[PDB]
Amino acid sequence: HKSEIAHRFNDLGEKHFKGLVLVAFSQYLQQCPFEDHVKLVNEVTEFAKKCAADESAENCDKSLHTLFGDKLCTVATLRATYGELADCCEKQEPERNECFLTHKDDHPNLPKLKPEPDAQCAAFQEDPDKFLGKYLYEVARRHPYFYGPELLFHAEEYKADFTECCPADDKAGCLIPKLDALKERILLSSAKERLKCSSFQNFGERAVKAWSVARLSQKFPKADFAEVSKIVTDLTKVHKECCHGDLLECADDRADLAKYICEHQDSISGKLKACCDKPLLQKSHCIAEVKEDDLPSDLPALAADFAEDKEICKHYKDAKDVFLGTFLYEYSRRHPDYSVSLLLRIAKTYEATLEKCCAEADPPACYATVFDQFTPLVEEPKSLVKKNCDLFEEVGEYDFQNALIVRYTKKAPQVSTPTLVEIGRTLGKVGSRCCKLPESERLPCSENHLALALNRLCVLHEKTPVSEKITKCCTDSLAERRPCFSALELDEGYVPKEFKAETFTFHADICTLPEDEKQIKKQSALAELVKHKPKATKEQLKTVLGNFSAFVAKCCGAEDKEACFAEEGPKLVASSQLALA
């Protein structure tokens, strides 16, 4: 097709097309006003029409990028708002996108989205086309790497929830429990995808594909290796393009892969029938979040092929990754109770065992026990979520977050306090989700989500490196990240942060904050206590945070709030230093 833009226009349909365009734009330029973005969509949407009707027209034959980054450059206020971003335009393709992507902001500090059960149905009954378009703008900008097509699906979750209850009697009774749940689902999905792009960008395709083979195997244990290799190829391609901004090609390829899975669902999984009865974006969303299919009764003994087989080694020399992928698919198949990372770790301990036993040794008798050189690999993460869910159930989420903040702040006290507080709080939320689960579901729940939070840390740390040791965890190896982080401990050369009184001076302003905001204030206080007394025990810190918390609550109910803070503040600070000896 000589017009790649026409081709995508006819394939995708105007809405989704324009929808993917707004999102493409809200991601590349994140603090441009909304109707500013809207305009840009039309100017490209319009061009696609001329080609859809006549491909031979000039400029219809050029790359989507060409025809998109061109549109970015022309816009006004791009330099005075985004700065360095404006520099990328002298560049050409392929480097222009390269450069643009660089300047996507993973920590934008734009203000929260407040759920307004009265005041926001104003735009709902007013105009759908700008209430959905708003939300897509509003989420794309706070998540520059969000899975392009999954967003259009969330938007229609947004649409349908006001539907059920905007003029309804008890407004925020039906609504706010929904938008809240949703808010969560966005952040998780954003974290899942950020990790897919983070892996392309740090470790290349080979890492994404092993991850997928592992994960689709667990999901579709009934499919066979060539069904799975097939889907993994198409699916990796789809995410490679999404992470590179080519949303249009990303969505088209996604539709085709949904179409494929649905046509062959009978040899993939019986969990797919429900997905396959749906409209497009629901169908794609549904496939991507499908539950793991039941294991097949005929599952063969792993032992023969990979333990008791007489000749495993020529297979290697000739079939390098191909043979490994086989192991990975067969192991992952019957272990829905392992995290993806644990599986890749085992698969590295086959490409490991197999090098020793076969080459420069006599294979069959020493590797006939390889399956037990994994039980250490398994016991470790099991003990770990054991401890941490014991701790969690014992003390609860806020105090679990507090512990992780302390734990992580000793590991890397050089990291800024907002980041420490974010990872601490994110890790604690994992505890909520993953510890209640049947205890065969919590290792994969926990460690898979741990992968997301850690990757978030690593992305922040990519923006502002402060510790060579973090850098080693984030970049040495994908499969080993969590182990690496578990190994960090307080640097014995660390010099405690010089004590700053201002840093624990509270005022009556903290009384108006919503509670999530009060907690962060406290939890930051907590990181800062650690950064200044890094050797204090978790038990001591708990006491001192107890006292700061009582002091806040007390004074926030005082008549002279501010003279309360004035008079009690400093006493506490002096008394706190002695307590943290």
Ligand SMILES: C[C@H](C(=O)O)c1ccc(C(=O)c2cccs2)cc1
């Ligand atoms: C990597 C870090 C560590 O131990 O250094 C860590 C390891 C494991 C966990 C952990 O198991 C959980 C948090 C929430 C539910 S389970 C939390 C943090």
